[PDB]
Design a protein around this motif. Structure first.
Motif, PDB file in Angstrom:
ATOM      1  N   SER A   3       0.445  -6.199   3.716  1.00 47.61           N
ATOM      2  CA  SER A   3      -0.587  -5.197   4.040  1.00 47.61           C
ATOM      3  C   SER A   3      -0.175  -4.251   5.153  1.00 47.61           C
ATOM      4  O   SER A   3      -0.795  -4.220   6.221  1.00 47.61           O
ATOM      5  N   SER A   4       0.853  -3.457   4.881  1.00 47.86           N
ATOM      6  CA  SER A   4       1.380  -2.506   5.841  1.00 47.86           C
ATOM      7  C   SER A   4       1.663  -1.148   5.184  1.00 47.86           C
ATOM      8  O   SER A   4       2.802  -0.879   4.750  1.00 47.86           O
ATOM      9  N   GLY A   5       0.592  -0.339   5.067  1.00 50.24           N
ATOM     10  CA  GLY A   5       0.665   1.130   4.892  1.00 50.24           C
ATOM     11  C   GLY A   5       1.034   1.693   3.518  1.00 50.24           C
ATOM     12  O   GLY A   5       0.393   2.638   3.022  1.00 50.24           O
ATOM     13  N   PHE A   6       2.096   1.140   2.933  1.00 49.68           N
ATOM     14  CA  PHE A   6       2.500   1.446   1.576  1.00 49.68           C
ATOM     15  C   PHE A   6       1.310   1.316   0.656  1.00 49.68           C
ATOM     16  O   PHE A   6       0.676   0.264   0.594  1.00 49.68           O
ATOM     17  N   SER A   7       0.997   2.380  -0.067  1.00 47.65           N
ATOM     18  CA  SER A   7      -0.246   2.414  -0.814  1.00 47.65           C
ATOM     19  C   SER A   7      -0.166   1.804  -2.230  1.00 47.65           C
ATOM     20  O   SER A   7      -1.130   1.929  -2.997  1.00 47.65           O
ATOM     21  N   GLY A   8       0.962   1.185  -2.587  1.00 46.29           N
ATOM     22  CA  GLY A   8       1.117   0.562  -3.903  1.00 46.29           C
ATOM     23  C   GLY A   8       0.497  -0.826  -3.989  1.00 46.29           C
ATOM     24  O   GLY A   8       0.398  -1.403  -5.072  1.00 46.29           O
ATOM     25  N   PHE A  66       4.547   2.720 -14.760  1.00 41.36           N
ATOM     26  CA  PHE A  66       5.445   1.557 -14.704  1.00 41.36           C
ATOM     27  C   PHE A  66       6.367   1.625 -13.481  1.00 41.36           C
ATOM     28  O   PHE A  66       6.613   0.609 -12.809  1.00 41.36           O
ATOM     29  N   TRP A  67       6.863   2.825 -13.198  1.00 42.31           N
ATOM     30  CA  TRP A  67       7.649   3.077 -11.989  1.00 42.31           C
ATOM     31  C   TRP A  67       6.855   2.733 -10.737  1.00 42.31           C
ATOM     32  O   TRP A  67       7.360   2.082  -9.835  1.00 42.31           O
ATOM     33  N   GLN A  68       5.587   3.124 -10.694  1.00 41.83           N
ATOM     34  CA  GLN A  68       4.787   2.791  -9.526  1.00 41.83           C
ATOM     35  C   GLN A  68       4.601   1.294  -9.393  1.00 41.83           C
ATOM     36  O   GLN A  68       4.632   0.773  -8.283  1.00 41.83           O
ATOM     37  N   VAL A  69       4.455   0.586 -10.513  1.00 39.79           N
ATOM     38  CA  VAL A  69       4.324  -0.878 -10.469  1.00 39.79           C
ATOM     39  C   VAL A  69       5.644  -1.506 -10.022  1.00 39.79           C
ATOM     40  O   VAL A  69       5.681  -2.357  -9.150  1.00 39.79           O
ATOM     41  N   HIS A 121       8.143  -3.942  -3.130  1.00 41.44           N
ATOM     42  CA  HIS A 121       7.540  -4.068  -1.799  1.00 41.44           C
ATOM     43  C   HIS A 121       7.135  -5.504  -1.524  1.00 41.44           C
ATOM     44  O   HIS A 121       7.460  -6.053  -0.469  1.00 41.44           O
ATOM     45  N   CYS A 122       6.433  -6.120  -2.476  1.00 41.38           N
ATOM     46  CA  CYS A 122       6.009  -7.491  -2.316  1.00 41.38           C
ATOM     47  C   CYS A 122       7.200  -8.403  -2.074  1.00 41.38           C
ATOM     48  O   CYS A 122       7.169  -9.252  -1.171  1.00 41.38           O
ATOM     49  N   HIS A 123       8.232  -8.253  -2.909  1.00 36.13           N
ATOM     50  CA  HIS A 123       9.379  -9.135  -2.823  1.00 36.13           C
ATOM     51  C   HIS A 123      10.097  -8.964  -1.491  1.00 36.13           C
ATOM     52  O   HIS A 123      10.487  -9.949  -0.879  1.00 36.13           O
ATOM     53  N   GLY A 176       8.526 -10.908   1.186  1.00 41.86           N
ATOM     54  CA  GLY A 176       8.554 -12.354   0.942  1.00 41.86           C
ATOM     55  C   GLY A 176       7.429 -12.919   0.064  1.00 41.86           C
ATOM     56  O   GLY A 176       7.150 -14.129   0.097  1.00 41.86           O
ATOM     57  N   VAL A 177       6.809 -12.062  -0.744  1.00 41.52           N
ATOM     58  CA  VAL A 177       5.657 -12.459  -1.565  1.00 41.52           C
ATOM     59  C   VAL A 177       5.921 -12.270  -3.071  1.00 41.52           C
ATOM     60  O   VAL A 177       6.338 -11.202  -3.506  1.00 41.52           O
ATOM     61  N   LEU A 178       5.632 -13.314  -3.843  1.00 37.41           N
ATOM     62  CA  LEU A 178       5.666 -13.278  -5.300  1.00 37.41           C
ATOM     63  C   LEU A 178       4.230 -13.245  -5.801  1.00 37.41           C
ATOM     64  O   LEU A 178       3.428 -14.129  -5.480  1.00 37.41           O
ATOM     65  N   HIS A 179       3.870 -12.215  -6.555  1.00 38.19           N
ATOM     66  CA  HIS A 179       2.465 -12.051  -6.966  1.00 38.19           C
ATOM     67  C   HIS A 179       2.050 -13.053  -8.054  1.00 38.19           C
ATOM     68  O   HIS A 179       0.976 -13.629  -7.999  1.00 38.19           O
TER      69      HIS A 179
END
Length: 273
Positions: A65-70, A116-119, A125-127, A130-133
């Motif tokens: 949760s740091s700024g990146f809006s994706g 798809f590019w945005q995803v 970003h998540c990875h 250190g996060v796997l959704h």
């Protein structure tokens, strides 16, 4: 303070993820989402640095949760005797991708390319945090219709990213890869790429490719709509039965089908406004 900080509006929905309400931050009239999770239903717990015990979802959310809006931002959270309450961003106007595809049918390839590019950028970003959704799918992607920006939601099935095998899974089965189905084992990144292939298919065809376990493990991809040969090739690669044969995110984003992506605002102007 709690209900003095936020004005609570109508229920947005409820399920395996808890109960979510539309809301407004009283101070600046920011639109927000208010998510209630019962303590009795939380399966995975973690701890914040200072030792405060929280659901894993809150750990994961703070890491991304740091700024990146994706990715959806956690603005605040609260503990109650029998539940936690999470306060999250809410774009307005918003529509989830499932709803959007149900409404429009198969997407034009130019639009699916932008989405798809945005995803892809959001999952990278998540990875990197250190996060796997673990539950990437059309329902968990919100479209900020004015900006043309996609946001990933619901880290309630997520985990810390690791390089060793996972033997637990509480996401959506029809987006799960064959090694999970056959062996109840998977690795994070290759499983993520499989679910992205399911998502890309869903975008260009207007429905998911496999419904039953037998279909998932059989890995025969039949296209029910006209899809360019380049796009079919990327999808088939992501849906390789052997994990090690699937592309890396780099390989996905260097694929010829992925070149010349529109910007979010152009996407909004051409396809959404």
């Amino acid at each position: 303070p709690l209900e003095s900080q936020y004005q609570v509006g109508p229920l947005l929905g409820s399920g395996g993820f808890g109960s979510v309400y539309s809301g407004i931050r009283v101070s600046d009239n920011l639109p927000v989402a208010i998510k209630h999770v019962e303590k009795d239903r939380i399966s995975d717990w973690g701890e914040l640095p200072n030792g405060t015990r929280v659901p894993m979802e809150v750990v994961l959310l703070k890491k991304v949760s740091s700024g990146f809006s994706g990715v959806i931002r956690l603005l605040d959270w609260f503990e109650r005797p029998d539940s936690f309450v999470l306060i999250l961003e809410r774009p307005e106007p918003v529509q989830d991708l499932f709803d959007f595809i149900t409404e429009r049918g198969a997407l034009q390839e130019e639009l699916a390319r932008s989405f798809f590019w945005q995803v892809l950028e959001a999952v990278r970003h998540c990875h990197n945090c250190g996060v796997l959704h673990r539950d990437i799918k059309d329902e968990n992607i919100l479209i900020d219709l004015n900006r043309g920006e996609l946001k990933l939601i619901d880290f309630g099935s997520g985990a810390l990213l690791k390089d060793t095998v996972y033997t637990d899974f509480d996401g959506t089965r029809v987006y799960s890869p064959p090694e999970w189905i056959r062996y109840h084992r998977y690795h994070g990144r290759s499983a993520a790429v499989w679910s992205l292939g399911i998502l890309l298919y869903d975008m260009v065809c207007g429905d998911i490719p496999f419904e039953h376990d037998e279909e998932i493990i059989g890995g025969q991809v039949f296209f029910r709509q006209r899809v360019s040969s380049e796009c079919q090739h990327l999808i088939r690669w992501c849906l390789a039965l052997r994990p090690s044969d699937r592309p890396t995110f780099e390989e996905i984003q260097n694929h010829p089908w992925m070149q010349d992506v529109l910007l979010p605002q152009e996407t909004a102007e051409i396809h959404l406004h």
